[PDB]
Amino acid sequence: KRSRKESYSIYVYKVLKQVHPDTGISSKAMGIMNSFVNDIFERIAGEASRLAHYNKRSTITSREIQTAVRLLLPGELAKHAVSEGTKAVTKYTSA
Amino acid sequence: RKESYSIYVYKVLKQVHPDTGISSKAMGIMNSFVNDIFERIAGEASRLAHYNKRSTITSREIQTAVRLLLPGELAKHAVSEGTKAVTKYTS
Amino acid sequence: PHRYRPGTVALREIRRYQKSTELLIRKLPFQRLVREIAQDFKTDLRFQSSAVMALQEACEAYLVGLFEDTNLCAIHAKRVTIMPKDIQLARRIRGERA
Amino acid sequence: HRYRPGTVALREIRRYQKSTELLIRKLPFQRLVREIAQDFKTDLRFQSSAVMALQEACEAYLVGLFEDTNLCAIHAKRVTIMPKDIQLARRIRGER
Amino acid sequence: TRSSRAGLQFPVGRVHRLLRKGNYSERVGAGAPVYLAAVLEYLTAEILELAGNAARDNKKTRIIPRHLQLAIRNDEELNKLLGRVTIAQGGVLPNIQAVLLPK
Amino acid sequence: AKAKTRSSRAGLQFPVGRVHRLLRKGNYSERVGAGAPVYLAAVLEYLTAEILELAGNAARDNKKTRIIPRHLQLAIRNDEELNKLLGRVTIAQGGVLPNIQAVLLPK
Amino acid sequence: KVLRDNIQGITKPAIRRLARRGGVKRISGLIYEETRGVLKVFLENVIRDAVTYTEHAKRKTVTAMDVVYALKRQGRTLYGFG
Amino acid sequence: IQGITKPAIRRLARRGGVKRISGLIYEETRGVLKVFLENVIRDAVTYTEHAKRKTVTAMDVVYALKRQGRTLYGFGG
DNA sequence: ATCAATATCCACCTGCAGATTCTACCAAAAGTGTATTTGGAAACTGCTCCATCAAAAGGCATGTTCAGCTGAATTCAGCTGAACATGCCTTTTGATGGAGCAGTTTCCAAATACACTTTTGGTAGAATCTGCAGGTGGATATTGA
DNA sequence: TCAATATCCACCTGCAGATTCTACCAAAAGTGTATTTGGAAACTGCTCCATCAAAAGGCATGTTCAGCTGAATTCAGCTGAACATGCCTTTTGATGGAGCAGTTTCCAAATACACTTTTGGTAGAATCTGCAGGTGGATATTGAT
Ligand SMILES: [Cl-]
Ligand SMILES: [Mn+2]
Ligand SMILES: [Mn+2]
């Protein structure tokens, strides 16, 4: 009787506060940001999906994701992209 | 091992043009074609299902997807021949 | 009376509308057109307040973008006035209908 | 006897459009292919066919880009494609 | 064979396995494979028919890529459908702009 | 002991679990490694952080403390890389970068 | 009431305005009818698909996602509606 | 890239149906072709590498062409 | 080289429609204890993929001549921009009726899962064949006189 | 045209590289049975969307005028095409050796399940507050003398 819908709204806002503590974002802009993350999400995962397949694999590893990222993102966006990922996965396994 | 639509394309080749044969490469082009469309059609059908919180791809998905994927008369005809084949296979 | 030379207000407007983001087509006429076109596909259709807005966002966007390529096509012909052929070339190259 | 300028061209055009063979020299291309590749990864090896793909793709693209180029030159009243034309076409296609 | 049951040449089995092993959906309905197969067949039909003609027109009895391109690009609809595809060894439809012609 | 959200575990703001659940229910693959959700949440977090930064700056330049689309557009269209990444995308309400062809300007 | 000839609703001042944001300083007179022709084609194609999605979902209402998914098909990916 | 001789380019521009060619075109065309290849190949390789291989098969190219919206028929699907 | 004539800036004002926060339930991650696999890792093929090595032969590079294409410079018919007056229709605001999304239940009809039996389709011989590739002989398409 | 190139162009024809056709051996595809489910059918709560009514001013329209842009010519400088040459880098053709895609065959590590708690998020309300919308001189920017 309620119908709960989800978005990365809360998360975007958390990241918004880290970069600019004094800045804020509007609903519409929060919407734009929501589309962004999904678009990208589907792009990354979809490419991931292909990689695994072209390679007769039934599991998408964090490795596929990364090559996906290389194929999808341009220049430094990708360089920096991969750095955060790797760091994130290394830190995760260790703790 | 390895597989291709060479056999089936060739069969179809024969019905329409019994007298003509098809080269290697040309055969190769036809294979590329089938796969592609297959992927496009299957891919979209996957998408329809998903938007509709469905976990099963019915032939209805295939059909609708084909409406979205194919142009004009190619589209009309495609739905017919495929709907015809199901009507027939089912009974 | 004071009079601005031709082209001077053209440039004035360009700066004006490029600095803003509001929609340039009047809302009602567009909603009307959307229903007419949609009606000729399926009868008794209904539209979400937002669905129409979406369409209008896409449309304006598309057209503004076409006019840019359009204008680069007039400039290439040493002209300064966009014409249909300027619009058609842009769409041929784009691949909308070669 | 001398064929007036440009007459041949039309005969070159009619000719080349009529065929489907590649028109870039096999070895120089393959040499080009390997070279670029090696700047990305080393001791790579290409399937004979892989180079055919790359060449087929390159030529096809290039011929297509020229059709759009020509159209841009004609549009400016010129009959000789120039670099601005090639740039215009690419700029409109969304390549840069 | 399911394919003869649907009166089709194309493997309805093969496609069903292709859809199952394809990641397209959680589960695949019985009519799907049939339906699609037939569509892949028909489209194939259609392109071969035109090629035939082309080959026939050229005086050959063997369909080759060039015949396929001619087939494809001459028809508007198939051209829309394979608009971002290139047939290897296809060549291009002969077309020379009027202005470039002798006056 | 007390539970560690997998995200905090990797030191990420985005939801690693939400991401994993969307990878599975997505039909992208039969199975999903434990590192993928993590890795991906991270790439999405950083990309979000990247456009948010340039947007804020643009909000600053215009004497506003609330980011709106225009700012996102301005952000996306000025950086070469984000502009290429989102080349076929249109931001509702984003307008266009002010740009006048040189030939059209006065003599 | 009967909807007819509403493509004419896209006035000339409007098209100018859209041409201004595009960066056009001078507009030929024939442009107006040509622009309408194009807009009506764009719309058709995008709405056609939208509705196809409304039909497969068996709804009487075209929703915003329908449009968005539709725009996505024609590679005119919209941000801000879902 | 200089291996891509001027008389071959002319041929390419000929199939494209071009009657007359400015002299600068050639260096220009060489530029563009270089970018094409660089982009198509980088992706091919990435794909080659993901497969943990030392050989760029014809399929890798095929896949990378797809990604660049330059789909190719005749070597795979 | 000046100056009205106008449009464009920039800062100060201030209520209010659009965020920011504040709180309660709950759908969903998190935590454990099993029950499979998945896809590396040694071992090794049979490949295709490099490498010479070695001649010929188109095919590329050149340096001449000039034919005609691009480029720049005027001129002027008239198209389209700028303006004003007119008065229509799109906006704004809110009111209602109710069609038809969606959220739950209920449960057959249908798709999934093994375990098995049959048949088909992919390979590598064996057996035809279509074009490739020249080679005449004869209108054609060009270009000069 | 009348002529004198150089070009295409069907007509005919002869084999080797492909094609297409055989002949068999595994991998799927099909059966038979037994289950798990997905999501169509049956309500029905209720947002949201279709419609209308009013007051009002924002703006679309249509007309005058005339500035200056597009287009039509004309001209000649010289760039890019046609050529006849001279020479060498591509062709290709084996011939061989060997890096390496591809197959196995185990198996330890990483996943999937199936539940049971335990939070993290979302969907309302309670609180705030940028900033939209106006106002007003300061500052150019234009266009007439
Ligand atoms: Cl140039
Ligand atoms: Mn109608
Ligand atoms: Mn021949």
Residue numbers in the entry:
A (entry chain D): 30 to 124
B (entry chain H): 33 to 123
C (entry chain E): 38 to 135
D (entry chain A): 39 to 134
E (entry chain G): 16 to 118
F (entry chain C): 12 to 118
G (entry chain F): 20 to 101
H (entry chain B): 26 to 102
Show the paper's wording.
On the other hand, the N-terminal tails of the four core histones and the C-terminal tail of histone H2A protrude from the nucleosome core particle. In the present study, we determined the crystal structures of four nucleosomes lacking the N-terminal tail of one of the histones, H2A, H2B, H3, and H4.
Thus, we concluded that the impact on the nucleosome structure upon the truncation of the H2A N-terminal residues 1–9 is minimal. In the nucleosomes containing tlH2A and tlH4, the initial phase of the disruption occurred at slightly higher temperatures than that of the wt nucleosome, suggesting that the nucleosome stability was not affected by the deletion of H2A residues 1–9 or H4 residues 1–15.
